[PDB]
Design a protein around this ligand. Structure first.
Ligand SMILES: *[B]([O])([O])[C][C][C][C][C][C][C][C][C][C][C][C][C]
Lengths: 165, 548
């Protein structure tokens, strides 16, 4: 019929075993299981990759990578511009698109049902339904960890000289 | 990270075996998470992954196990720009003045009043990429500036790449799939399969420059320091094109290091060079792999791996769980001799006793000798010419070794280094009796758990990084997802742990359960077959669905 469906088994220590008939159902299971354990972590890291840390937390805080909120936000706003995200999505295979669509839907399903049993950030304005673009933002953040990501502060600091001697 | 793949010629069962020991953060966007994925008939893979990714990053399947370590290859280049003498916002390529591009981003900032303000920021860009400034080294003055070209910005293949790896049957298939797509951004890949092949690949996305361009296109001062820096005023220094590469400007797969053997391969973040010393990997671009002295983790691994005795699963496990501080093997014997030559030097007395009684480990019950040794090494690192036997490229596994105590200046500086280290240790708040496990911990809510292991720079295979917080050292990264895989007839047997546990949320039943196990170094079955899964008395099942 449609659309997304997954069978999840958990063994000791909360390890999920996800079975599905296609990538979309598989992603659904992954997103739901991961949310049960780590919704707050993902939401925080998505705020970072969206360049919204200063909006929620102010200029005095840092990301989990220990970058100041504003320079981090400038870097991720630069990296994850709409045109970059859309080019990236357009280059994805149907299978990968489906994995990501399922993941977002599964994470969101858990959020709809969450009553705080395994989620400490219930009620925070930054804990919100996610989109496939948010997963692209996280992916690109990881992609550049071996490159321009290590120069985030240096990019933000790059300004032309003044009148100095 | 460590990785060891063992093949049919060395494994006790004549089949493949893989130890995966990545060293990664215990929190945040790189926190590993275990999962098993199955689309019956065509996908069945288990391992661990990074947050947000719907694929397995390090794992195993019916006939194959693989893992990754961060490589030494460059994945970007800096470009030194020659600025227009009339305008520092313009730069010269082949003598022609080009304008920088400007891209403004706007950010909302929550103020003290709790309201949002808008902040705009200009990002300057060249044809190579954005400009970057490191004050005092990479400045933007009226003569020069630096731009950065990141090779992975155009790597749209990265998710596809791991999904493809997740579908791989054996080592040959894995190699085909990685070489075909070239979507791996910044790690090596090591793998073993049931038939007993052991594979190392330095197959990642690396800027390509034809060999004849490198001498003139490099910035000599900067590459000497290990920065991949090129001359950005010459159009001939653009990354080279080769139709065989999966992406314009990257190095084709055939020019990247691969070693396929039946004995072993290993990597602990050094270059491809001594993956297996019996078959050194040489002759590659400096952007890819260089013959640099290996670090103590690799030197430790090779000391255990070399030779003719069969390797058992237990052997690989215990290379991790022994917590041996391998750097001590090079300096501790001569250091203790200095201690013996200096009894009655009251300032060295406590340090010398602690070092002498020390088990040379980073175990929970290792004594304060480890702490003294760490602080001494931090200072020894920085002394000039103090090795008795300095690095010998003809003996890259056995050097450097020893302290040059027969040189009076060295003996003087080494003793002073120990005196200073001892002083530092003793003016810290460390009690009497205290063992390493009393000091290094992972906080869980209102409680702590003692964590074994120590910094990888001291040659501890079980690498653990911690930072001082209050009365303790708080673990921030290191050993994370552990998997040790063998292939008996029934199906793959995987054993390991996720050191920091599945959940980062203090409310979860899975916030500290594996962390208690990691403390006691008690690895567990990673159940993969339906039979293994059904045998778990903790088994729970949920089926979920919703409309598209
Ligand atoms: B070690 O200390 O060298 C750490 C290496 C482990 C990191 C392996 C992660 C697998 C890479 C996934 C990248 C995905 C990018 C989107």
């Amino acid at each position: 019929p449609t659309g997304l469906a997954a069978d999840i088994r958990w063994t000791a220590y909360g390890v999920p075993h996800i079975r599905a008939k296609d990538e979309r159902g598989l992603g659904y299971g992954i997103g739901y299981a991961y949310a049960r354990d780590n919704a707050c972590l993902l939401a925080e890291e998505i705020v970072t990759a969206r360049g919204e840390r200063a909006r929620y937390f102010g200029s005095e805080g840092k990301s989990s990578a220990e970058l100041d909120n504003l320079p981090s936000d400038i870097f991720y706003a630069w990296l994850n511009q709409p045109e970059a995200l859309q080019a990236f999505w357009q280059a994805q295979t149907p299978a990968v698109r489906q994995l990501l669509e399922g993941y977002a839907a599964g994470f969101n399903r858990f959020l709809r049902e969450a009553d705080g049993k395994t989620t400490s950030c219930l009620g925070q304005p930054w804990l919100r339904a996610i989109a496939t673009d948010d997963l692209l933002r996280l992916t690109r953040r990881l992609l550049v960890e071996g490159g321009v990501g290590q120069f985030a502060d240096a990019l933000v600091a790059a300004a032309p000289p003044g009148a100095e001697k | 990270s460590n990785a060891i793949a063992v093949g049919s010629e060395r494994s006790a069962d004549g089949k493949g075996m893989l130890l995966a020991n990545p060293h990664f953060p215990w929190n945040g966007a790189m926190r590993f998470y275990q999962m098993h994925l199955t689309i019956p008939g065509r996908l069945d893979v288990m391992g661990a992954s990074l947050p947000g990714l719907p694929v397995v990053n390090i794992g195993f399947s019916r006939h194959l196990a693989w893992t990754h370590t961060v490589d030494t290859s460059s994945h970007f280049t800096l470009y030194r720009l020659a600025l227009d003498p009339k305008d520092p916002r313009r730069y010269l390529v082949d003598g022609r003045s080009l304008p920088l591009e400007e891209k403004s981003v706007a950010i909302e900032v929550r103020g003290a009043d709790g309201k949002l303000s808008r902040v705009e920021h200009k990002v300057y860009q060249s044809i190579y990429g954005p400009l970057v400034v490191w004050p005092g080294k990479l400045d933007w003055n009226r003569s020069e500036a630096y731009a950065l070209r990141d090779a992975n910005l155009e790597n749209t293949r990265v998710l596809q790449q791991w999904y493809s790896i997740n579908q791989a049957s054996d080592v040959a298939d894995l190699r085909r799939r990685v070489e075909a797509l070239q979507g791996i951004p910044w790690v090596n890949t090591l793998a073993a399969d049931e038939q007993g092949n052991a594979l190392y690949m330095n197959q990642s996305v690396v800027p390509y420059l034809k060999p004849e361009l490198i001498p003139a296109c490099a910035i000599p001062q900067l590459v000497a320091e290990g920065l991949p820096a090129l001359q950005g005023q010459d159009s001939r220094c653009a990354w080279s094109r080769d139709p065989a590469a999966a992406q314009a400007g990257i190095t084709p797969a055939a020019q990247l290091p691969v070693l396929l053997r039946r004995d072993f391969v290993q990597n602990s973040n050094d270059s491809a060079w001594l993956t297996n010393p019996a078959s050194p990997l040489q002759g590659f671009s400096p952007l890819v792999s260089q013959e640099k002295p290996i670090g103590p983790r690799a030197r430790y691994a090779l000391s255990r791996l070399q030779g003719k005795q069969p390797l058992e699963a237990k052997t690989l496990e215990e290379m991790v769980t022994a917590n041996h501080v391998f750097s001590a093997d090079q300096v501790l014997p001569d250091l203790l001799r200095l201690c013996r030559d200096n009894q009655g030097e009251k300032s060295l007395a406590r340090a010398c006793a602690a070092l002498a009684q020390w088990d040379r480990g980073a175990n929970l019950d290792s004594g304060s000798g480890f702490v003294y040794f760490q602080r001494f090494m931090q200072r020894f690192a920085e002394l000039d010419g103090a090795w008795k036997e300095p690095f010998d490229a003809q003996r890259p596994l056995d050097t450097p070794q020893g302290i040059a105590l027969d040189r009076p200046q060295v003996a003087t500086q080494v003793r002073q280094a120990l005196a200073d280290a001892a002083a530092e240790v003793e003016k810290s708040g460390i009690p009497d009796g205290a063992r390493w496990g009393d000091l290094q911990v992972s906080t869980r809510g209102q409680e702590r758990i003692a964590i074994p292991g120590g910094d990888g720079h001291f040659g501890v295979y079980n690498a653990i990084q911690s930072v001082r917080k209050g009365d303790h050292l708080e673990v921030v990264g290191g050993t994370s997802y552990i998997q040790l895989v063998t292939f008996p007839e029934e199906g793959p047997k995987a054993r390991g742990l996720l050191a920091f546990s599945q959940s980062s949320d203090p409310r979860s039943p899975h916030y500290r359960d594996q962390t208690e196990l990691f403390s006691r170094q008690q690895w567990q079955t990673l159940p993969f077959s339906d039979r293994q899964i059904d045998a778990d008395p903790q088994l729970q099942r949920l089926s979920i669905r919703e409309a598209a």
